[PDB]
């Protein structure tokens, strides 16, 4: 027992990180087979960050202007191309450490591990969720461009995120591995609205089930509710509406604990209306929404 | 910016995990050079967990009774020995993936990454702190025996923890890599007192400095205090007394933010006396004590 925000073991990804330099800009890339993936930011300079003309910038660059190093091993670049907001650098050697892998576009509310990296070198790993508004609340310093997010399922790494930017509000924005931003963002250094976020209701419910499984049970009550009545409360407190698809996804946890989903919703309702009363759940004094139902079942069995 | 509970990249440790089976018991071991390290629990059965006679149990075992597998690679055991609560299995092959490493006994209040593992296979990574009372609040299921905790400093892995047991209270106890328990614990399935814990004051202070560095600044106030006056409050709220050694360790963060340590202590005092008033700091509604000053400076630069 115990309940922690747990990342995937990062070894399979650490073997794929490289440094890519173009001119004076250095950032991180991902070396899979004989292709290196990195943010197209690598071809900009300060003085054109307000609205870079990436097509013009890239035309000035040849293969030999991209310097790629994997540890101290230098790679030879034999092709380049831009797709959306990513660059694909063809190199002459396949990465011997390439894991079984896939590129996935995750949904808002889904979680993934981030391997924060600087100069091609891994520095730490943590879990986060793709917010409803398609931002992430990461931890990323100057040089973190190109860091990647992923899930692992039996030795297959599903890459889902490549880090680009910090918005002026402190939250983070990035792309899938095909270079398409999650959310409305563009790769320029400008104030950009993220728009209203919400709390991920089905994850909060998953986490309450995890709490019960660990014997934090104080918030269970003698009430039930309906989907409609709970959704009234969800809207009041800026939670996502609960659908029968969410109820279905919560069925294993329901069955395991013997607590019907709508009974757990009645507990959540009471927590939203009354607060926590200066108590804690699984070591938190807030309602936590960055564990999916799949995460809870992983860590709870 | 942003502030997350970040683990070390686990790749260097994942290459060292193996499965060790003795009779019907399977748990995790750590393969470094030509030695496999694992909890001596591996030689017990149910029916002798209340007070195992490990010396007698081990006498019944020969080299060939320890089955060690690294992936599907089986290792040949050519010696065994017990030291404290660990077994050292000499094998005939040095681990080709052995990192540069050291064994360290960490101090209470220090943090480390845990690689949770089952059947020799890594499942996830998370950060925690060694509590003042020498427990850890981990996440560990049946089969987690032998999982390890570590820090990494420039490609040198400092192993500091090997997981043994869950106490009946849900918190976790384990040893250094020489098999000595942290705390008063013994490897038997018995209720055992951990004794009073405290909050790690110097870490809470570090975390407030991290909050300021990220622009969560609402708790700063117009007051100061003395070490003596703050220690009166620390004792009231079951915080560790603050020493000048702790003040000295906080000096870089002090210098970076321009906030004197005793002025930050006055903020903390006010937080302890008044609570958080339904607000948050770095995404938490509690005072967080699992980031050391060294952790904050790592993640904040
Ligand atoms: Na959650
Ligand atoms: Na802390």
XYZ file of C-alpha atoms and ligand atoms in Angstrom:
604
model
C 0.000 0.000 0.000
C 0.759 3.709 -0.105
C -0.068 5.987 -3.032
C 2.421 8.031 -4.879
C 2.656 9.976 -8.119
C 4.788 7.345 -9.922
C 6.531 7.783 -13.264
C 7.434 5.029 -15.681
C 11.013 3.756 -15.459
C 12.808 6.088 -17.891
C 15.681 3.794 -19.085
C 14.197 3.010 -22.487
C 13.817 6.735 -23.214
C 17.160 7.870 -21.770
C 18.927 5.799 -24.448
C 17.235 7.818 -27.172
C 18.034 11.361 -26.028
C 20.567 13.415 -28.012
C 21.704 16.993 -28.251
C 20.967 18.919 -31.473
C 22.649 22.231 -32.224
C 21.941 24.469 -35.242
C 23.919 27.717 -35.240
C 23.937 28.967 -31.659
C 20.800 27.133 -30.423
C 21.037 23.826 -28.560
C 18.106 21.658 -27.483
C 17.162 18.017 -27.014
C 16.283 15.456 -29.643
C 14.919 11.938 -29.754
C 16.842 9.369 -31.786
C 14.662 6.481 -32.968
C 15.961 4.152 -35.671
C 17.847 6.442 -38.082
C 15.739 9.550 -37.406
C 16.269 12.323 -34.907
C 13.148 14.278 -33.883
C 13.463 17.752 -32.384
C 11.503 21.064 -32.089
C 11.855 23.277 -35.143
C 12.855 26.006 -32.590
C 16.436 24.749 -33.115
C 16.707 26.897 -36.287
C 15.664 30.234 -34.740
C 17.707 32.921 -33.059
C 16.801 35.618 -30.547
C 15.707 38.575 -32.695
C 13.207 36.452 -34.633
C 11.215 34.832 -31.759
C 8.155 37.052 -32.077
C 7.121 35.465 -35.392
C 9.777 33.191 -36.994
C 9.472 32.415 -40.682
C 10.425 28.753 -40.261
C 10.269 27.861 -43.966
C 12.742 30.687 -44.764
C 14.947 29.885 -41.853
C 15.166 26.219 -42.801
C 16.061 27.020 -46.406
C 19.275 28.620 -45.118
C 20.265 25.344 -43.430
C 21.945 22.304 -44.954
C 22.436 18.819 -43.467
C 25.881 19.733 -42.206
C 24.509 22.684 -40.205
C 22.698 20.289 -37.819
C 25.080 18.936 -35.168
C 23.805 15.887 -33.392
C 25.604 14.226 -30.522
C 24.565 11.131 -28.544
C 26.809 11.226 -25.522
C 30.134 12.140 -27.196
C 29.243 10.079 -30.308
C 28.641 12.566 -33.168
C 25.970 11.492 -35.734
C 26.087 12.207 -39.436
C 22.964 13.912 -40.818
C 22.046 12.845 -44.335
C 18.595 14.459 -44.617
C 16.326 17.018 -42.994
C 12.691 17.857 -43.201
C 10.126 19.880 -41.265
C 6.751 18.375 -40.364
C 4.403 20.830 -38.539
C 6.506 22.059 -35.585
C 9.124 19.298 -35.558
C 12.276 18.672 -37.518
C 13.177 15.133 -38.700
C 16.948 14.683 -39.133
C 17.828 11.525 -41.000
C 21.118 10.158 -39.718
C 23.357 7.454 -41.125
C 23.252 5.125 -38.029
C 20.209 3.490 -36.465
C 20.108 4.017 -32.658
C 21.188 0.583 -31.234
C 19.172 1.414 -28.087
C 15.894 2.095 -29.932
C 13.018 0.598 -27.883
C 9.896 -0.909 -29.375
C 7.886 2.273 -29.761
C 4.803 4.074 -31.206
C 3.789 7.722 -31.624
C 0.407 8.557 -30.024
C -1.672 11.674 -29.686
C -3.079 11.532 -26.201
C -6.424 12.787 -25.042
C -6.964 15.574 -22.437
C -7.177 13.972 -19.014
C -4.600 11.246 -19.859
C -1.307 11.065 -17.976
C 2.301 10.459 -19.054
C 5.858 10.558 -17.745
C 8.141 13.396 -18.729
C 11.891 12.931 -18.922
C 13.228 16.439 -18.353
C 16.492 16.814 -20.273
C 19.154 19.512 -20.801
C 21.896 19.436 -23.440
C 20.809 15.884 -24.451
C 21.297 14.654 -20.865
C 18.393 13.325 -18.716
C 17.899 15.153 -15.440
C 14.701 13.843 -13.892
C 11.396 12.108 -14.383
C 7.897 12.923 -13.194
C 4.310 12.218 -13.991
C 1.800 14.713 -15.286
C -1.591 15.037 -16.946
C -2.624 16.683 -20.169
C -5.014 19.355 -18.884
C -8.483 19.798 -20.416
C -7.167 22.976 -21.953
C -4.212 21.061 -23.474
C -1.487 22.565 -21.283
C 0.728 20.694 -18.874
C 1.901 21.880 -15.471
C 5.477 20.754 -15.823
C 8.837 21.628 -14.423
C 11.064 22.877 -17.231
C 14.031 25.245 -17.281
C 15.861 26.987 -20.093
C 17.321 24.218 -22.377
C 14.373 21.795 -21.839
C 13.085 22.174 -25.358
C 12.731 18.738 -26.915
C 12.149 16.882 -23.669
C 9.627 14.106 -24.169
C 6.606 12.550 -22.497
C 5.647 8.961 -22.783
C 3.841 5.908 -21.449
C 5.225 2.360 -21.390
C 3.159 -0.815 -21.828
C 5.228 -4.065 -21.690
C 8.476 -2.812 -23.254
C 6.559 -0.636 -25.845
C 7.153 3.053 -25.369
C 4.273 5.281 -26.632
C 5.690 8.727 -27.137
C 3.032 11.373 -26.821
C 4.583 14.719 -26.012
C 7.587 16.787 -27.026
C 8.147 19.934 -25.016
C 8.275 23.358 -26.664
C 7.385 26.353 -24.649
C 6.430 27.997 -21.405
C 3.586 30.403 -21.699
C 3.851 33.720 -19.824
C 1.561 32.195 -17.179
C 4.121 29.506 -16.171
C 2.306 26.492 -17.692
C 3.721 24.417 -20.562
C 2.784 23.709 -24.191
C 4.071 21.184 -26.678
C 3.380 18.876 -29.593
C 2.823 15.269 -30.502
C 5.748 13.525 -32.278
C 4.284 14.584 -35.641
C 4.826 18.199 -34.542
C 1.145 19.169 -34.040
C 0.593 21.341 -30.960
C -1.820 20.156 -28.302
C -4.152 23.055 -27.956
C -4.340 26.379 -29.838
C -0.642 27.222 -29.417
C 1.948 28.352 -31.945
C 5.722 28.246 -31.527
C 6.351 31.954 -31.093
C 7.185 34.010 -28.062
C 3.866 35.752 -27.575
C 1.166 35.852 -24.979
C -1.332 33.121 -25.946
C -4.621 32.291 -24.206
C -5.022 28.750 -22.985
C -8.603 29.269 -22.060
C -10.628 27.884 -19.240
C -9.396 24.709 -17.605
C -11.504 22.209 -15.687
C -10.822 19.504 -13.113
C -10.741 15.949 -14.537
C -13.715 14.403 -12.704
C -13.134 10.766 -13.638
C -9.560 11.009 -12.320
C -10.652 12.532 -9.032
C -13.113 9.630 -8.709
C -10.309 7.108 -9.516
C -8.204 8.717 -6.789
C -10.991 8.461 -4.215
C -11.215 4.717 -5.039
C -7.433 4.529 -4.479
C -7.959 6.275 -1.123
C -10.526 3.677 -0.056
C -8.266 0.823 -1.216
C -5.621 2.253 1.129
C -8.049 2.716 4.068
C -8.524 6.504 3.855
C -12.282 6.142 4.139
C -13.409 9.105 6.186
C -15.116 10.899 3.251
C -17.480 8.019 2.448
C -20.988 8.943 3.357
C -24.565 7.595 3.610
C -25.691 9.385 0.404
C -26.088 8.661 -3.308
C -26.801 10.926 -6.272
C -27.719 10.803 -9.972
C -25.573 11.605 -12.986
C -27.769 14.644 -13.596
C -27.637 15.922 -10.017
C -23.843 15.384 -9.809
C -23.330 17.161 -13.119
C -25.092 20.219 -11.685
C -22.488 20.300 -8.938
C -19.659 19.469 -11.399
C -20.604 22.557 -13.422
C -20.717 24.764 -10.294
C -17.176 23.754 -9.306
C -15.687 23.677 -12.820
C -15.381 19.926 -13.046
C -15.836 17.993 -16.309
C -19.331 16.450 -16.682
C -19.451 12.771 -15.954
C -20.625 10.504 -18.742
C -21.653 6.862 -18.755
C -18.372 6.194 -20.575
C -16.585 7.481 -17.463
C -18.823 5.376 -15.242
C -17.908 2.310 -17.351
C -14.202 3.046 -17.125
C -14.582 3.188 -13.307
C -16.339 -0.172 -13.156
C -13.313 -2.284 -12.109
C -12.664 0.022 -9.148
C -16.337 0.015 -8.277
C -16.380 -3.778 -8.315
C -13.139 -4.062 -6.261
C -14.362 -1.738 -3.474
C -18.029 -2.557 -3.578
C -18.820 1.182 -3.825
C -21.157 2.067 -6.697
C -19.903 4.887 -8.925
C -22.865 7.105 -8.089
C -22.271 6.575 -4.354
C -18.671 7.688 -4.832
C -19.966 10.690 -6.791
C -22.107 11.564 -3.693
C -18.989 11.555 -1.605
C -17.266 13.798 -4.114
C -20.279 16.127 -4.122
C -20.045 16.487 -0.369
C -16.304 17.163 -0.579
C -16.909 19.860 -3.198
C -19.701 21.482 -1.172
C -18.105 21.220 2.274
C -14.361 21.136 1.544
C -11.932 18.823 3.395
C -12.433 20.331 6.854
C -8.652 20.574 7.392
C -8.200 16.763 6.794
C -6.193 14.847 4.190
C -6.727 12.128 1.591
C -3.709 10.038 0.578
C -1.476 12.773 1.951
C -3.152 15.580 0.024
C -5.274 18.449 1.321
C -6.705 19.007 -2.219
C -8.679 16.795 -4.596
C -6.166 15.251 -6.954
C -6.948 14.826 -10.622
C -3.679 13.492 -12.177
C -4.336 9.814 -11.743
C -6.346 8.067 -14.368
C -8.458 4.971 -13.493
C -5.791 2.897 -15.416
C -3.043 4.492 -13.218
C -4.876 3.634 -9.968
C -5.343 -0.033 -10.949
C -1.656 -0.234 -11.993
C -0.360 1.117 -8.665
C -3.065 -0.555 -6.494
C -2.458 -3.986 -8.145
C 9.618 27.145 -13.958
C 7.100 24.869 -12.278
C 7.876 22.632 -9.305
C 7.397 18.951 -9.258
C 8.420 15.980 -7.144
C 11.066 14.720 -9.618
C 12.876 11.387 -9.456
C 16.281 10.632 -10.895
C 16.287 8.985 -14.326
C 16.174 5.284 -13.399
C 18.016 3.737 -16.425
C 21.285 3.067 -14.620
C 19.422 1.169 -11.887
C 16.993 -0.711 -14.148
C 19.973 -2.508 -15.720
C 20.937 -3.932 -12.343
C 17.613 -5.418 -11.228
C 17.219 -9.215 -11.158
C 14.813 -11.759 -9.784
C 16.019 -14.067 -6.981
C 14.059 -17.153 -5.980
C 14.905 -19.503 -3.087
C 12.383 -22.308 -2.602
C 8.952 -20.778 -3.128
C 9.859 -17.127 -2.367
C 10.647 -14.655 -5.149
C 11.850 -11.080 -4.680
C 14.094 -8.498 -6.311
C 17.862 -8.290 -6.269
C 20.525 -5.831 -7.320
C 23.337 -7.118 -9.526
C 26.516 -5.043 -9.238
C 29.773 -6.426 -10.613
C 29.654 -10.156 -9.784
C 27.507 -9.798 -6.651
C 23.760 -9.949 -6.270
C 22.312 -8.183 -3.205
C 18.867 -9.108 -1.903
C 16.833 -9.166 1.377
C 17.522 -12.228 3.500
C 13.675 -12.638 3.494
C 14.212 -14.735 0.333
C 15.045 -17.782 2.517
C 11.912 -17.718 4.708
C 8.530 -19.314 4.225
C 5.094 -18.474 5.600
C 4.906 -20.387 8.896
C 8.188 -18.901 10.134
C 7.547 -15.136 9.616
C 6.887 -14.326 13.264
C 10.540 -14.871 14.236
C 12.705 -16.525 11.522
C 15.954 -18.148 12.575
C 17.889 -16.838 9.569
C 21.200 -18.515 10.450
C 19.445 -21.926 10.605
C 17.445 -21.291 7.510
C 20.516 -20.305 5.515
C 22.435 -23.399 6.599
C 19.837 -25.500 4.761
C 20.589 -23.643 1.513
C 23.389 -24.252 -0.972
C 24.520 -22.089 -3.911
C 22.350 -24.041 -6.314
C 19.205 -23.313 -4.271
C 19.397 -19.598 -5.207
C 17.916 -18.981 -8.666
C 18.882 -15.679 -10.165
C 17.556 -14.404 -13.458
C 18.361 -11.118 -15.227
C 15.681 -10.857 -17.858
C 15.665 -14.467 -19.146
C 19.456 -14.768 -18.630
C 20.003 -17.210 -15.721
C 23.080 -16.467 -13.519
C 25.274 -19.065 -11.885
C 25.740 -18.605 -8.125
C 29.172 -19.587 -6.858
C 28.961 -18.217 -3.298
C 26.519 -16.939 -0.705
C 26.800 -15.046 2.505
C 24.540 -13.138 4.887
C 25.517 -9.680 6.133
C 23.011 -8.181 8.652
C 19.656 -8.391 6.818
C 20.968 -8.832 3.274
C 22.212 -11.786 1.300
C 25.240 -11.447 -1.034
C 25.141 -13.988 -3.888
C 28.418 -14.216 -5.743
C 27.770 -15.002 -9.390
C 30.157 -16.066 -12.123
C 29.468 -13.090 -14.508
C 29.987 -9.398 -13.812
C 26.892 -7.323 -14.760
C 27.924 -5.608 -18.074
C 25.469 -2.798 -17.219
C 26.977 -2.037 -13.789
C 27.021 1.768 -13.303
C 29.689 3.644 -11.405
C 28.244 3.275 -7.927
C 28.685 3.627 -4.117
C 26.769 2.366 -1.076
C 25.692 5.163 1.314
C 23.778 5.298 4.550
C 21.607 8.355 4.269
C 20.566 10.673 7.035
C 16.933 11.285 8.165
C 15.546 14.190 6.174
C 17.475 13.245 2.986
C 15.607 12.266 -0.172
C 16.110 9.523 -2.774
C 14.424 7.900 -5.758
C 12.831 4.499 -5.392
C 12.572 2.121 -8.324
C 9.588 -0.045 -7.418
C 10.119 -3.511 -8.895
C 8.218 -6.829 -9.048
C 9.668 -10.168 -10.161
C 12.955 -8.408 -11.119
C 11.071 -6.041 -13.456
C 10.936 -2.237 -12.885
C 7.442 -0.816 -12.591
C 7.786 2.819 -11.585
C 9.912 5.513 -10.039
C 9.171 8.154 -7.432
C 10.891 10.378 -4.965
C 10.656 10.120 -1.212
C 12.287 11.230 2.024
C 13.735 9.245 4.875
C 11.485 10.352 7.743
C 12.959 11.534 11.060
C 11.728 8.288 12.523
C 13.541 6.319 9.775
C 10.441 5.121 7.919
C 9.511 5.946 4.361
C 6.034 6.636 3.019
C 6.360 4.583 -0.121
C 4.131 2.788 -2.534
C 4.926 -0.922 -2.431
C 2.838 -4.007 -3.167
C 3.383 -7.683 -2.481
C 6.597 -8.722 -4.381
C 8.364 -5.337 -3.862
C 10.912 -6.742 -1.470
C 14.381 -5.843 -2.701
C 13.360 -2.681 -4.512
C 16.034 -0.029 -4.148
C 16.417 3.676 -3.459
C 19.178 5.797 -4.786
C 20.567 9.189 -5.747
C 22.609 9.946 -8.872
C 25.416 12.519 -9.097
C 27.074 12.733 -12.571
C 26.768 9.082 -13.642
C 27.573 7.812 -10.055
C 24.678 5.999 -8.471
C 24.665 6.126 -4.619
C 22.487 3.300 -3.433
C 21.009 4.023 -0.047
C 17.918 1.932 0.523
C 16.721 -1.608 -0.080
C 13.075 -2.242 0.672
C 11.985 -4.882 3.181
C 8.709 -4.484 4.894
C 5.447 -2.692 5.425
C 4.606 -2.097 9.017
C 1.002 -2.694 10.131
C 0.520 1.089 9.967
C 1.083 1.234 6.164
C 4.522 2.926 6.231
C 7.712 1.249 4.980
C 10.992 0.048 6.512
C 14.225 -1.108 4.953
C 17.997 -1.311 5.109
C 21.147 0.185 3.698
C 23.039 -1.995 1.163
C 25.057 -3.505 4.030
C 21.767 -4.881 5.390
C 21.456 -2.600 8.462
C 17.886 -1.415 9.070
C 17.195 2.299 9.192
C 15.467 2.708 12.479
C 14.672 0.184 15.241
C 13.112 -2.400 12.906
C 13.713 -6.130 12.579
C 12.767 -8.328 9.628
C 9.883 -10.199 11.214
C 6.166 -9.905 10.764
C 5.286 -8.228 14.035
C 3.843 -4.953 15.147
C 6.821 -2.614 15.684
C 6.726 0.973 16.973
C 8.256 3.595 14.742
C 7.916 6.269 17.326
C 7.165 9.916 16.990
C 7.844 11.535 13.645
C 8.500 15.216 13.026
C 8.290 17.537 10.030
C 11.659 18.282 8.366
C 11.910 22.045 8.970
C 14.883 22.788 6.723
C 13.092 21.093 3.810
C 9.903 23.057 4.354
C 12.051 26.215 4.312
C 13.775 25.048 1.064
C 10.334 24.527 -0.466
C 9.159 28.010 0.506
C 12.274 29.399 -1.258
C 11.278 27.317 -4.312
C 7.786 28.845 -4.072
C 9.213 32.373 -4.117
C 11.516 31.509 -7.041
C 8.369 30.488 -8.937
C 6.385 33.619 -7.928
C 4.126 32.057 -5.267
C 4.867 34.877 -2.852
C 1.635 35.465 -0.996
C 2.902 34.029 2.332
C 5.835 36.446 2.627
C 5.225 38.876 5.403
C 6.607 42.012 7.114
C 7.964 40.033 10.113
C 11.214 38.434 11.272
C 12.004 36.106 14.168
C 14.946 34.580 16.056
C 16.200 31.009 16.026
C 15.049 30.697 19.633
C 11.580 32.137 19.041
C 11.068 30.000 15.894
C 12.201 26.883 17.730
C 9.471 27.485 20.318
C 6.932 27.351 17.514
C 8.734 24.408 15.828
C 8.341 22.411 19.049
C 4.632 23.318 19.342
C 3.914 22.028 15.828
C 6.236 19.000 15.930
C 8.823 20.395 13.568
C 12.555 19.658 13.896
C 14.505 22.460 15.652
C 16.431 24.668 13.308
C 20.176 24.840 13.795
C 22.786 27.193 12.391
C 23.931 24.256 10.250
C 20.483 24.322 8.625
C 20.684 28.088 8.227
C 24.070 27.650 6.487
C 22.721 24.994 4.152
C 19.925 27.439 3.176
C 22.367 30.241 2.411
C 22.433 29.834 -1.402
C 18.635 30.093 -1.546
C 18.700 33.039 0.813
C 21.242 34.796 -1.386
C 19.328 34.001 -4.627
C 15.998 35.385 -3.339
C 17.306 38.125 -1.124
C 15.163 36.775 1.749
C 17.104 36.213 4.975
C 16.622 32.765 6.512
C 15.107 34.193 9.683
C 12.633 36.255 7.631
C 11.566 33.078 5.843
C 11.248 31.390 9.245
C 8.824 34.235 10.233
C 6.726 33.413 7.233
C 6.741 29.754 8.186
C 5.775 30.666 11.755
C 2.767 32.566 10.485
C 1.767 29.656 8.241
C 2.001 27.263 11.192
C -0.016 29.558 13.471
C -2.647 30.662 10.951
C -2.767 27.794 8.438
C -3.040 28.352 4.657
C -6.455 30.033 4.703
C -7.719 27.740 1.913
C -4.851 28.846 -0.461
C -2.072 26.864 -2.142
C 1.714 26.935 -2.453
C 3.262 25.305 -5.528
C 0.036 23.379 -6.012
C -0.104 22.051 -2.459
C -2.542 22.896 0.326
C -0.071 21.490 2.934
C 3.491 22.410 3.891
C 5.750 20.067 1.977
C 8.843 18.609 3.577
C 10.238 16.144 0.957
C 12.477 18.534 -0.894
C 15.918 19.115 0.452
C 17.727 22.458 -0.152
C 19.991 20.515 -2.643
C 16.823 19.262 -4.465
C 15.375 22.793 -4.778
C 18.599 24.213 -6.266
C 18.795 21.252 -8.697
C 15.240 21.740 -10.003
C 15.279 25.585 -9.788
C 18.632 25.790 -11.681
Na -6.588 11.668 -9.797
Na 10.263 20.318 1.158
